[PDB]
Design an enzyme around this catalytic site. Sequence first.
Site, short mmCIF file in Angstrom:
data_model
loop_
_atom_site.label_atom_id
_atom_site.label_comp_id
_atom_site.label_asym_id
_atom_site.label_seq_id
_atom_site.Cartn_x
_atom_site.Cartn_y
_atom_site.Cartn_z
N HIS A 1 0.93 -1.15 -0.19
CA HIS A 1 0.31 0.13 -0.07
C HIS A 1 0.76 1.17 -0.13
O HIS A 1 0.41 2.55 -0.31
CB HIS A 1 -1.13 0.01 1.02
CG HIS A 1 -0.57 0.29 2.24
ND1 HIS A 1 -0.75 -0.74 3.45
CD2 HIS A 1 -0.25 1.34 3.13
CE1 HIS A 1 -0.10 -0.24 4.50
NE2 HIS A 1 0.05 0.97 4.26
N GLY B 1 2.22 6.14 9.40
CA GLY B 1 3.74 6.10 9.06
C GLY B 1 4.32 4.85 9.69
O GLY B 1 5.58 4.64 9.36
N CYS C 1 3.49 1.86 9.16
CA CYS C 1 3.59 0.92 8.42
C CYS C 1 4.77 0.12 7.90
O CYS C 1 5.81 1.00 7.64
CB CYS C 1 2.46 1.00 7.09
SG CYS C 1 0.69 1.32 7.62
N1 LIG Z 1 -2.87 -2.34 4.62
C1 LIG Z 1 -3.58 -1.23 4.69
C2 LIG Z 1 -4.45 -0.24 5.00
C3 LIG Z 1 -5.68 0.03 4.38
N2 LIG Z 1 -6.21 1.21 4.64
C4 LIG Z 1 -5.50 2.09 5.53
C5 LIG Z 1 -4.54 1.77 5.68
C6 LIG Z 1 -3.72 3.21 6.64
C7 LIG Z 1 -3.71 2.66 8.12
O1 LIG Z 1 -4.06 1.51 8.50
N3 LIG Z 1 -2.92 3.54 9.04
C8 LIG Z 1 -2.44 3.20 10.30
C9 LIG Z 1 -2.35 4.26 11.17
C10 LIG Z 1 -2.01 3.74 12.50
C11 LIG Z 1 -1.74 2.47 12.67
N4 LIG Z 1 -1.59 1.50 11.62
C12 LIG Z 1 -1.97 2.12 10.60
C13 LIG Z 1 -3.55 0.80 5.70
#
Ligand SMILES: N#Cc1cncc(CC(=O)Nc2cccnc2)c1
Lengths: 304, 304
Positions: free
Chosen positions: B41, B143, B145
């Site tokens: 992603h 951030g 990920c």
């Molecule tokens: N894969 C995937 C995905 C899908 N939709 C959105 C995201 C963004 C996300 O999950 N952000 C984040 C923020 C705080 C902690 N952890 C992750 C990621």
Amino acid sequence: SGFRKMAFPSGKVEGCMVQVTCGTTTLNGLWLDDVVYCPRHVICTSEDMLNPNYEDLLIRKSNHNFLVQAGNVQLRVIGHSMQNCVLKLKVDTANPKTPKYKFVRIQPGQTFSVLACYNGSPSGVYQCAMRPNFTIKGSFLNGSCGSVGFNIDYDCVSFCYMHHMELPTGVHAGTDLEGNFYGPFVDRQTAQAAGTDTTITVNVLAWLYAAVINGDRWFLNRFTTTLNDFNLVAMKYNYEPLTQDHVDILGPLSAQTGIAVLDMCASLKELLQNGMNGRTILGSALLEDEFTPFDVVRQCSGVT
Amino acid sequence: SGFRKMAFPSGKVEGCMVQVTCGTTTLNGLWLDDVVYCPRHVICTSEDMLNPNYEDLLIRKSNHNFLVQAGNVQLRVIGHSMQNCVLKLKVDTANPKTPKYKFVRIQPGQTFSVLACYNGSPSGVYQCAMRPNFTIKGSFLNGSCGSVGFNIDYDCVSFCYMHHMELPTGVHAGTDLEGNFYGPFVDRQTAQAAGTDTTITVNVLAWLYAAVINGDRWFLNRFTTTLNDFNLVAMKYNYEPLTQDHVDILGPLSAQTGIAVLDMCASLKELLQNGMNGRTILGSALLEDEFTPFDVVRQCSGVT
Ligand SMILES: N#Cc1cncc(CC(=O)Nc2cccnc2)c1
Ligand SMILES: N#Cc1cncc(CC(=O)Nc2cccnc2)c1
């Protein structure tokens, strides 16, 4: 989202851990520049520990009696001195992995990470706090002495603790990196009892702010209080008195959440008086006190 | 003595963290040998995340669109491929700090350490468990990920998790290092709900053994039970069923303490039915389930 008991990344400290052996005693040392720091009780036999005279025991030791091993290679000891309860062994090689560092003496309530080691090898890292009775609740076995506590500000490691002893109650005592014990403890195998382990109030409040930021809001109530009224209840529950300095330090968390510090104190006061009623806050059934206000801001903002 | 939630020393993993940027999206990557692994992603805009077609989005990307930075220096991307939900970016330089490593896919109930990173920089390390519903309760902000989960066996790092997503409930989902999500989750900004977060029974028992080893014995009772009787109570309290494989794994702890596994099950059964009555076990007011039997043995024996 989510709030965890988080330690600093330990790599910078792992690069400083060495094994120090004197006679038949082996413990951990911290190698910074050309000096290895370790608990002075490395020179003691278990018999000497009952009533040691360190200056007298040190007369029977020479540089070559201190064996320092970094990884699988031996360091040459060219000098040794005792500073309070730590030995400083000067070696002929500066640690190439020496990070930027400071030696700090922390106050009770301050938190730090510990890299628990055995034979100069890191086994684990955990976060803890200097208790108000100057003990730490660690996880240390025989051979862990010389393991260190630290905080990191970007690239500078501030070392604040070196493990020395386990009290008969299973709580821990140690020194700063200048060899001065925290609290009234001495490096002797004599029964030493800890004082009251009170709860670090400013840290509980910081953690309640972390809970609000993360969606755990059930405990927020419709009341407020004053520092004097709150402190009457705090004394009753063996909580540390809250001062205006603590209120000041919680200011950024108050601003972020829109919850006045005294209102959070009133929520805490009701939690003390009513209990949790089988509920949890941030996955805990008791009020957590080993996160400082700085830790809550750092974790909630992602400081690297 | 003392029992702490302990993470593995993170140094070996810190040496692998890099920043990966694609367009306006920046996240973390894991650099092992000449490959950088990161969540696919990274190629998405927030708009693309609502319903992404990764193969289609990847057609508009070339090697030079992936910016990989290790410390303050840029890595040259010479190839890229998608494996399930991770991107593998081949770089022209093998990571000089690549530790011995394996990619493992863990089972629910297994624990691991997480090095939480932002912009390819480590901010903290914590210990967690793969929940029985295949979520993890982490501490991750935007951030984070690409931050990874791992276990270490002496000098070999087994990577088991890479962070990808936060569910609308604030729990986390991710993949193994082959890009396969744990559980039924998908990398899409669509509402996905987690199943029942049951308690990892074998881990609670291991932690009760750790408590006995450390002097917390108040909960030991005069009863025993059977696997079938215990499991009737476990089902009622949303605890995972205990099998003979779990009993086998607890054998070393049973031998060390002299407490038969089924007797410990009977103590646990009474704790479920009676509650803690305001008491604590290893400084906790609830039954801890994020220590495996292997973790209890390792921490209690000092494995480095
Ligand atoms: N894969 C995937 C995905 C899908 N939709 C959105 C995201 C963004 C996300 O999950 N952000 C984040 C923020 C705080 C902690 N952890 C992750 C990621
Ligand atoms: N200083 C000092 C000192 C005095 N008397 C005895 C010792 C040995 C000691 O405290 N051992 C140990 C064991 C498990 C955890 N931590 C420390 C040390």
